[PDB]
C-alpha cells in the first residue's frame, strides 16, 4: 500500500514551482513525501478524535476545520 507514491514527482515539482523554486535536487522527493505524511497524520488524528467524541462514523468538514484550527492553521471557506 504505497499510496504515498501517489504523490508523483511532477506534482511535487509543480508545488515547488508555485513556491518560486527554479532548480530541484533529486533527493527532494522522498523528503517531501515524509514531511507530508507527518503533517497528514498529525491532522487526521485530531479529526478522528473530534469525530468519535460525537459518536459518529462520518468525518465531517467541521471536524477537519477544528483540527486545523487547533494546530494554529485556520482555514476559511469550509465553515458550512
Amino acid at each position: 500500500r504505497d499510496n504515498i507514491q501517489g504523490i508523483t514527482k511532477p506534482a511535487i515539482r509543480r508545488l515547488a514551482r508555485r513556491g518560486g523554486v527554479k532548480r530541484i535536487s533529486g533527493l527532494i522527493y522522498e523528503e517531501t513525501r515524509g514531511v507530508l505524511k507527518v503533517f497528514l497524520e498529525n491532522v487526521i488524528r485530531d479529526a478522528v478524535t473530534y469525530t468519535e467524541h460525537a459518536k459518529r462514523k462520518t468525518v465531517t468538514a467541521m471536524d477537519v476545520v477544528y483540527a486545523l484550527k487547533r494546530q494554529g492553521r485556520t482555514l476559511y471557506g469550509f465553515g458550512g
Partner: protein
Amino acid sequence: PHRYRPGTVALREIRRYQKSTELLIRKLPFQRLVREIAQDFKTDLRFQSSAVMALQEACEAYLVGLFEDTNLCAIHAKRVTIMPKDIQLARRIRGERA
C-alpha cells in the same frame, strides 16, 4: 532543432503556476492516501467530500509555504538548487522538528 536553455522553461512554469489558483495534486491518489492513513486510527470510517477537499487545500498551502522557506535557505548558501538540508533547516527554525 529549437531547444531552450536550461532554466527558461523553469521561469515560464513559475509564472504560470503563480498566476493560477488550481490544485496541483490529482484528487484520487490523495483520497486513497488519506483513507490509508486514517485506517490506523479507526477502522471503517466514512468521509464527506468536503472533508477531503479541506485536507487537500490545507496540505497544498503547507507545502507551498515550506518550499518558499526552503528557497530562502538555499539562496542564503549561494546556490539555486534546493537540497534536503535546506528543508531540514527551515523546519528546524520553524520549530516543527525542535
